[PDB]
Ligand binder design. Structure first.
Ligand SMILES: CCCCCCCCCCCCCCCCCC(=O)OC[C@H](COP(=O)(O)O)OC(=O)CCCCCCCCCCCCCCCCC
Ligand SMILES: CCCCCCCCCCCCCCCC(=O)O
Ligand SMILES: CCCCCCCCCCCCCCCC(=O)O
Lengths: 384, 384
């Protein structure tokens, strides 16, 4: 729609690049001179554009490699089977019927495994190609030289698709991974402050997105290893795995924010008057943690190295101040009258928030370690 | 491999059914008498078997309705466009190229909305059909009496696929949903015991499956409404949504077990000497909760109603005993010496573990209420 297009103007360009490739193919088809070989079977060239045109360059290269491997293997096996069938001379229609059963059984069985679950598009092309070659080459009997004219058009369609996809506003999966890693830091930094403000008041998509994107980052990393060097990523083998390592450390840090958010929806809650004692100490930690996460995200985005000053000094000091405050007023969290039930559970429930906050601060040193590793493997610019 | 056959023997029945349908079609094709139309185009029937065969029966009905809708809309638009194009006369190829560009842009833009992620297969059978009908019907001027003969072979392949799929050992999505719901209770029950035992030692897939398969239940629900009555689910409008409501309540209860597991991986851990004091109470709650979850899962499995006894009496008693114990020995969690850092946090972690366990026991009434509602909407039988 208008809103969807304006929000992400990329989709309009992708739709008009697909329309351009279809027009550039239909013009050749409709103006080509008559031929005895490609004047009736030319349709196989405009339907390849609709099947091999993906959203990124790396996806197009990898999927096209898989489809060409399946097609060439199915064609070689079908040619061998057809040549071998003639030996019997009287049960050809039975041998060719048993071949279909055997190959279809194995092709279906092998595509249901829990490992090759993302490559069913390459198994289906094998199953369609074996059947097409075996059935269409029975009456004619010379599909050897007819199967290459149907691959020449496929090659023309895939060449046009790749040229139009690559030389007109390409979309790179590496930049997608870079942008996603930059965006997760801001999502977590917003959620942490929303949780602290909601609890102290007299938050979902942040950690939801930061915890449910491991598959997306893995797929984007798989696509990114095919693309050639370009732009700022000037190196033969860029270290794309350190981006996944930094996102794993960030998710380990965001699981405590998810626990903090779940502390607000619980059935048992402490009285509002008791929460107001630790307001300043609770707010300072959220402020410093969000500042740190935004500073790390900004350094990642600009491809810059960490400065010489310690970044964790302020948050560490705030955590120590909160600990001392908790120690001073510890008698609010328990009752010494019984020292040797809803009210007691409520009173003890106010210390879970502070214990989880201190554990969140304790988990922040491994994100800095992973960032230093990434800033070293990939040559980041020296700070100004 | 071979072991996968024994683990799930129904994937070998699926592969053999696929081979059976392929060989029935190949046996009709290899023996059909010569005809003026089917002697050369009888390969469109065996290709449809490989496209419209699905694991379940409701997925086959739903995706064959989507595919037939796309094919017929595309064919009607293409024929009307060709007839309107002939009116222009000259520049007719300019008109056809413009039409192909506009339709390709629209069909590419409409399959990118985030509300249509699951129908990106019913949008791709419309652009192939439009381009096929427009390009192949230009050099003869007649493509209306041939498309009728090209659709009969498709309807024959789809009729054979559905007959063989539905009359030889069918698989039902409602049974898959029923079994998934029954297995979630077992997984959560095993995870709670694993977490408590691991904490008290001198777990992951359990809650992971329950909290990481929400879309699976909705996909099986979308397929299950298309299937006819059968077996014990003898009702035209089966409340398949109450299974989803029960799974949602169980997921809400599994989010606390996730945090109980996370307490073991923290960087701050309490001393074991203080841990040993609260051992019998923790184990009693850890066994009562698992026995209740396994009883609810068993009563869902056999479709039986709740008895006259109260299932939550024992867990409530164990929780009250744990709270009284915490109240007696509360002086070990806090220090009264400085009443008005690492050691204090380590001591305070015990209260977090106890509080999370108590919240787990406090959230079970929602699951019991959901089970009672499900056993009311569907006619569950009376106990014994
Ligand atoms: C109103 C009247 C309306 C009536 C309606 C009339 C019906 C109109 C019919 C239009 C049908 C045309 C649609 C296009 C066909 C469907 C495509 C499809 O669905 O499949 C997708 C399916 C899945 O695609 P993917 O998952 O995206 O990869 O596979 C395909 O892409 C198409 C493959 C077709 C099989 C071609 C096999 C060719 C043989 C190999 C070539 C020779 C190489 C061997 C070399 C020798 C080696 C030594
Ligand atoms: C009825 C027309 C059918 C046309 C089906 C086209 C499907 C093509 C699938 C094979 C893609 C091969 C990718 C390009 C390989 C290469 O360029 O060498
Ligand atoms: C040429 C390749 C074939 C591609 C087929 C894609 C379109 C599939 C449409 C399936 C509709 C089947 C209708 C069956 C009618 C019935 O038996 O009730």
């Amino acid at each position: 729609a208008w809103e969807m297009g304006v929000s992400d103007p990329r989709k309009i360009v992708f739709s008009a690049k697909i329309g351009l490739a279809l027009t550039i193919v239909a013009l050749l088809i409709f103006y080509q001179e008559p031929n005895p070989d490609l004047s009736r079977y030319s349709v196989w060239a405009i339907l390849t554009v609709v099947v091999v045109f993906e959203f990124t360059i790396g996806a197009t290269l990898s999927k096209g490699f898989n489809r060409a491997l399946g097609t060439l293997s199915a064609g070689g096996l079908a040619l061998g089977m057809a040549e071998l069938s003639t030996l019997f001379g009287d049960w050809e229609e039975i041998f060719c019927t048993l071949s279909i059963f055997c190959i279809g059984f194995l092709a279906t069985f092998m595509k249901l495994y829990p490992s090759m679950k993302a490559y069913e598009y390459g198994f289906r092309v094998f199953l369609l190609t074996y059947c097409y070659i075996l059935i269409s080459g029975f009456r004619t009997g010379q599909f050897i030289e007819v199967a290459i004219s149907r691959f020449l058009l496929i090659a023309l369609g895939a060449g046009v698709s790749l040229g139009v996809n690559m030389f007109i506003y390409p979309i790179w999966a590496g930049e997608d991974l870079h942008n996603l890693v930059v965006k997760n830091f801001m999502n977590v930094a917003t959620s942490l402050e929303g949780c602290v403000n909601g609890y102290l008041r007299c938050v979902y998509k942040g950690y939801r997105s930061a915890v449910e994107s491991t598959s997306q980052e893995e797929s984007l990393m798989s696509f990114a290893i095919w693309e050639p060097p370009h732009g700022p990523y000037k190196s033969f083998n860029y270290p794309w795995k350190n981006y996944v390592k930094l996102s794993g450390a960030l998710k380990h840090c965001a699981f405590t924010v998810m626990a903090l958010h779940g502390c607000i929806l619980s059935e048992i809650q402490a009285p509002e008057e008791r929460r107001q004692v630790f307001r300043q100490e609770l707010q300072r930690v959220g402020v410093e943690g969000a500042k740190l996460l935004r500073e790390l995200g900004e350094k990642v985005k600009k491809m810059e190295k960490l400065g010489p000053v310690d970044l964790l000094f302020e948050v560490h000091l705030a955590a120590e101040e909160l600990q001392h405050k908790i120690d001073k007023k510890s008698y609010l969290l328990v009752n010494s009258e019984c020292w040797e039930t809803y009210e007691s559970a409520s009173a003890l429930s106010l210390a879970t928030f502070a214990s989880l906050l201190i554990e969140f601060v304790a988990r922040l040193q491994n994100v800095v370690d992973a960032f230093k590793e990434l800033s070293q493997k990939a040559n980041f610019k020296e700070p100004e």
